[PDB]
Amino acid sequence: VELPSLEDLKVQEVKVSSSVLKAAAHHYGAQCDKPNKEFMLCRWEEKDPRRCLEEGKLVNQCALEFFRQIKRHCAEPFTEYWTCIDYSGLQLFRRCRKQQAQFDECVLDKL
Amino acid sequence: SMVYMNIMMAFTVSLVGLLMYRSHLMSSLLCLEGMMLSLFVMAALTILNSHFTLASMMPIILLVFAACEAALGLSLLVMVSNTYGTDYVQNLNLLQ
Amino acid sequence: WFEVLPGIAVMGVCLFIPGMATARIHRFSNGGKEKRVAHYPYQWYLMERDRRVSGVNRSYVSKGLENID
Amino acid sequence: MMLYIVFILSVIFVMGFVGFSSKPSPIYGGLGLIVSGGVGCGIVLNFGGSFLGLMVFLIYLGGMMVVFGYTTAMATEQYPEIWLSNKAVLGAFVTGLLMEFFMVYYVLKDKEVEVVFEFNGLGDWVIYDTGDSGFFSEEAMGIAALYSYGTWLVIVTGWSLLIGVVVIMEIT
Amino acid sequence: VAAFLKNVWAKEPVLVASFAIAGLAVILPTLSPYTKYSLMINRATPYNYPVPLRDDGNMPDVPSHPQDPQGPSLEWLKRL
Amino acid sequence: MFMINILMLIIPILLAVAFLTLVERKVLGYMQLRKGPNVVGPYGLLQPIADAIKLFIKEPLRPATSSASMFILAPIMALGLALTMWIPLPMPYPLINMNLGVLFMLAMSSLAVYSILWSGWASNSKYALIGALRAVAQTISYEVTLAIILLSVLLMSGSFTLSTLITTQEQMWLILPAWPLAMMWFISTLAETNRAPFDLTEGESELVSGFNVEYAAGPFALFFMAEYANIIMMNIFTAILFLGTSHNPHMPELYTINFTIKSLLLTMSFLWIRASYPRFRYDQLMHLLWKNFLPLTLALCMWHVSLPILTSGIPPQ
Amino acid sequence: LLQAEKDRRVLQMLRENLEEEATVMKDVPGWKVGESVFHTTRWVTPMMGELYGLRASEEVLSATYGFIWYT
Amino acid sequence: PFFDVQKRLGVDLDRWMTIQSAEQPHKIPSRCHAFEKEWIECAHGIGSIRAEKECKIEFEDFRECLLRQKTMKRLHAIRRQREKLIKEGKYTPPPH
Amino acid sequence: NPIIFIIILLTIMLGTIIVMISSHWLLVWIGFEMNMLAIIPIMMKNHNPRATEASTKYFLTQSTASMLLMMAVIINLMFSGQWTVMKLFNPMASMLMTMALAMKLGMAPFHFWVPEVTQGIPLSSGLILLTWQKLAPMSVLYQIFPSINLNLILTLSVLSILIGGWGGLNQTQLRKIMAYSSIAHMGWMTAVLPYNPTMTLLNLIIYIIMTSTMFTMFMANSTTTTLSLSHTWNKTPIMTVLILATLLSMGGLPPLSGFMPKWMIIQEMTKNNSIILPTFMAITALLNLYFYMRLTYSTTLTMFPSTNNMKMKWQFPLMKKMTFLPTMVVLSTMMLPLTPMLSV
Amino acid sequence: MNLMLALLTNFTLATLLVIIAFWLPQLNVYSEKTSPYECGFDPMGSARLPFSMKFFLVAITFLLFDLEIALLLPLPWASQTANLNTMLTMALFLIILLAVSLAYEWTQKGLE
Ligand SMILES: CCCCCCCCCCCCCCCCCC(=O)OC[C@H](COP(=O)(O)OCCN)OC(=O)CCCCCCCCCCCCCCCCC
Ligand SMILES: CCCCCCCCCCCCCCCCCC(=O)OC[C@H](COP(=O)(O)OCCN)OC(=O)CCCCCCCCCCCCCCCCC
Incomplete structure (x- = not known):
């Protein structure tokens, strides 16, 4: 077999934790929809994940800008949102249901 | 790997000299129920790493007969002691 | 109806210890947070990922949005 | 704690059988099975399937091993003895006990000796060999027990047991 | 026969309570329209991942945007 | 500091079985119109620390006509499974998060009868030879009265873990939708763990014949000890299953306070039954399992299969 | 995304376990570098010994036996 | 003799739990699912007496997918390629 | 007792159908498991x-003969x-297969x-x-047939008639004389099974008929050979003529129809340039006839009907079904140009 | 790796207290009459354990009712499923298949 080099690796890796990744996570996937759904056809409809390395970076690079937008515009209700849901045990969604609209007070409106 | 040689060495708990002999026949029916778990385990190691997803209902059903089988065989071993009081495999009357 | 209450009050305390002890070990060993549970093998995959990227060697320290800016 | 925790269990399980495979006076025969049944369940409780191991305690070790000891009183009630206090027990205990080590001795302790005894090596972490991970469905092993597709299976095994009582409702 | 359901319930009301719960248990799934919702709930719980399809001629429905009015009616549960 | 947690659970519970032997008789005393242990305490409270040292001074004979390796192995397996069963049990956090641990209770409650079959055999003759054979026979028959109606609530819980068994009861106190099963849940553990009305096990048992009949106070000191460890453990298992308390993650302190108060109340009933009712005369003991207990348990089993379907109320897992 | 961050791990793992194998020994009674065990050239999944080779010291134990016997 | 009732009238008595790639209740395949579907494609209308000596390629790799016999030997001999030269340098790779 | 005697008897043949109706080694395990439960x-x-x-000497012989079969399944589960x-x-599975199953059909070993x-x-x-468990x-x-070692299936079958023959000349008890020559008629059919496995079933259907009609003749009183004397002049002299006809038919004499198998089965055994194999067995079943002669020398020559009763x-x-058995078990040798094209 | 050190603590504390309570004052310096008086109130008892039929059928009957609760065991896992008319009508079969095995045996139990 033949493999790609040590280059086409070492991309800008999203270094976040598990709960802050699961924090937004819901607004995330349902509005990008060009690089990622096509990446599934690049993995399901043809196999051998050694050919399919372009769109693995197309899903990654746009996700870099998703968190870059949320830091500049509104991060004050965001950081307290994944604070309470990180108060752990299964990461339930019915505990911080009260504090969910204070995050989404402007995500529908501001941006 | 070596997790199959042990246990395929442990399948030799039949060993036929001690599958009907010597007396106290309960010692022989012992290894008949103890020959299971050398089949219940040797199946379970193979269905589980190689994700078959369906054949793992077969080790559940492997116990269900061999329990009912040996329970039947244990009924008759009372009947040999109901007539005597001792099982003692060196009882033999009907020749061959 | 009086002297039986001290007999209760030594037995009854003796089960208040192990509930308070274990609840203040997991919350204390992992720094003021509950302990991550993992029933399904997908749920393990988040922790073992998070150990590789959190800070040193732990599944109980956070990274935050401000980490990657 | 080691990588060799599976291999160190199974040798006990092999020596569990040689405990009762020879002739131990059938009340220590129970102490050959319950030892092996737990140690054997120590193997099966790896690899993912824990429901399939914990049933071996309930239906085998909980069900059959009472009745196997609920007899040996109503029959075979002679004056009991212990194994290894006689000459016919110890003469067969050592016979496989060497091969219980001798099979281990050269399967891989040599480098490769030579062609026929080196295809299967001990260790290392490829005993499980299940990477990578899966999904949030089950182990699985979890979505396997089915009152779906198999119906001909259950309609026999249900009905095979129903004649199991009627055979024993007679002679006794 | 109408006394037999009252002159054994004066002697052994033990197994009579068993048949009364054995019956009226097989009967009811053929009765209420709450069932087949028990199969309708149980069908639209996604375990696996939805792989997409490809456009080739058809184009039957359901374009690249999911929040368009594209897919079937499983949104009666949020109103439920 | 995981090792300091295990010792923080074995040691504070040996007091609660030693300070139950004292409340065994004060509660049983005011039913007779008489005070508790009056003179040594002052209130009694210092009785068991004096009543423990006497047993380990008094000479632990072995019987001359006894066996050796069986007689001193059953008290090893007595305290083993009497204390190992306390592990997977949430209050509010368990020591161990087993995926399926409700079944592990029956994996622990099954092997306890395999010591009675030893000790009745291991020592000696007829007052424990046949007299313990008919004590294994009652304890085996009350698993099928037990394991069915333990499964009969799991069709409504959803799965096998115990964290879901507190989640499903946040608004119900589940003794109400299953109160016929809750009756036969009680009497099973009242007879399986060898207690006062169904009492051919211990000392009411022809009033002379027991498994305690031969153990001098050396090895005897655990048998009683270990045994009293089951009876506060089926009570800690009933009150996590039917009468479930409320869990708050921000305040775990108020869980245990409202929790230990409840298992103590059910533990009173094992004392409060003994001062009312006589025995059952071994036939009628087992005459009411098959003929009388069992066919109702299948009846509600078929009831609890169809009712989650014909309500469209499937529990999620 | 969690898929596309996982497949990048093993190709790094395959490259270092081959490139730091191809510099170990080049014997004429030795191996070719870049071969497969199978005739068919198609991307089969790797194995535990493929990813984690003869190292087997600490972290390989936590990889296999991590989900089992506890969080 | 093999009557084969279940081919006449279309019930599956079993037929589903037989092979490694049949149904998969929630579509989780095995470790060698790719070679089952490939090998059964070989011998379908072939009468299996010429299939033993003609196909012979799609079966052998599938046997070696399942046990990993020579893959473990090419791995084991690398422990003897190096690792007598523990003391003769070439740590390879340095951590990490 | 009467109704439950059918439900036990009904499920014996229901156990053996699942053996035949199966595409799956698990179901053929259940199939003659419950036969060993319901006998x-x-x-x-x-x-x-x-x-x-x-029955306890019957039992554990068919528990192990069960148990090695499930061992043979789990080996080629791995493969x-x-x-x-x-x-x-x-070959490590099929060797363990055939000489496990050789106990239920019992061959010359086992x-x-x-x-x-x-x-x-x-x-x-x-x-x-005991004709279902041979069936x-x-x-x-019939299915495992193109995977055997061809030496073991003959060595259990060459020993079959050489030791099922000698075993019963030393007998009187006519149940043993029926128990013997029941290994011998398992010797002729599995000597052929590697070569054209049909024209084996021809021998089996003949063997069900001729043996079933032997027991029905025996159900007047008959226990021992000396009791086989005392019914010619007492019960019915037509019984003596009938019990002659089937034995002389079951010996393989060409005026009757027990010569129907061999005559056809050597048409297959040679045509495969194997000549020293049938000449051994064809001369071996000759002292399988000295059971039957010296049995017919009891009843058909008025040997001492004493003790006047x-x-x-x-x-x-x-x-039941007796009037039609010695009319297809004797007179069929002309009427079968192709029985082996119905059964084929 | 504590499961497995969650119980080997519990058994080595169990076998600790046995030998300290039993075996340590078993080496004490008293007179210790070893005469055959150690058996209580059944002095000689020169007999073998006799067979009791009504206490054998209790063993076998339980064993055949114990098997098909393990068939009945994955009923809560058989809820989140596909086709459920099959799942309901097959689950009701085994219980009745357990129930008939009562009623036949129920016409003859004996003094159990
Ligand atoms: C007289 C003194 C001499 C005797 C001393 C020894 C006595 C020991 C007796 C102890 C008997 C207890 C055996 C109980 C076995 C059941 C253990 C079990 O099932 O644990 C539950 C768990 C199941 O896995 P899971 O729930 O899915 O984990 C969550 C993953 N997210 O499983 C796990 O969490 C991890 C599974 C692997 C853990 C190691 C294997 C457990 C068994 C080790 C001991 C072997 C048994 C010894 C023989 C028993 C004899 C009675
Ligand atoms: C159509 C809609 C659906 C319909 C649903 C209807 C629901 C109905 C629910 C009924 C099922 C639950 C009731 C359980 C049955 C009771 C058990 C039983 O049957 O006992 C019968 C027993 C036999 O004796 P008997 O028949 O009376 O004959 C002697 C008379 N001389 O006689 C007895 O009474 C024995 C009494 C018990 C024996 C033990 C007593 C010891 C003390 C126990 C005290 C327990 C107190 C409560 C337990 C704790 C509760 C939290």
């Missing part, structure tokens, strides 16, 4: 202490994982399963039910 009551019915000490009933893909059971069961009435594993060797009454047993 044990039929051994018992009148509760005599030989019968209880005979290629297909569970259809076909060739077994491993010896005394056949005399020690059938002798002295007080139910001599039937015990025609279930033969339905398994008159049966002045008629007979009312149930000789």
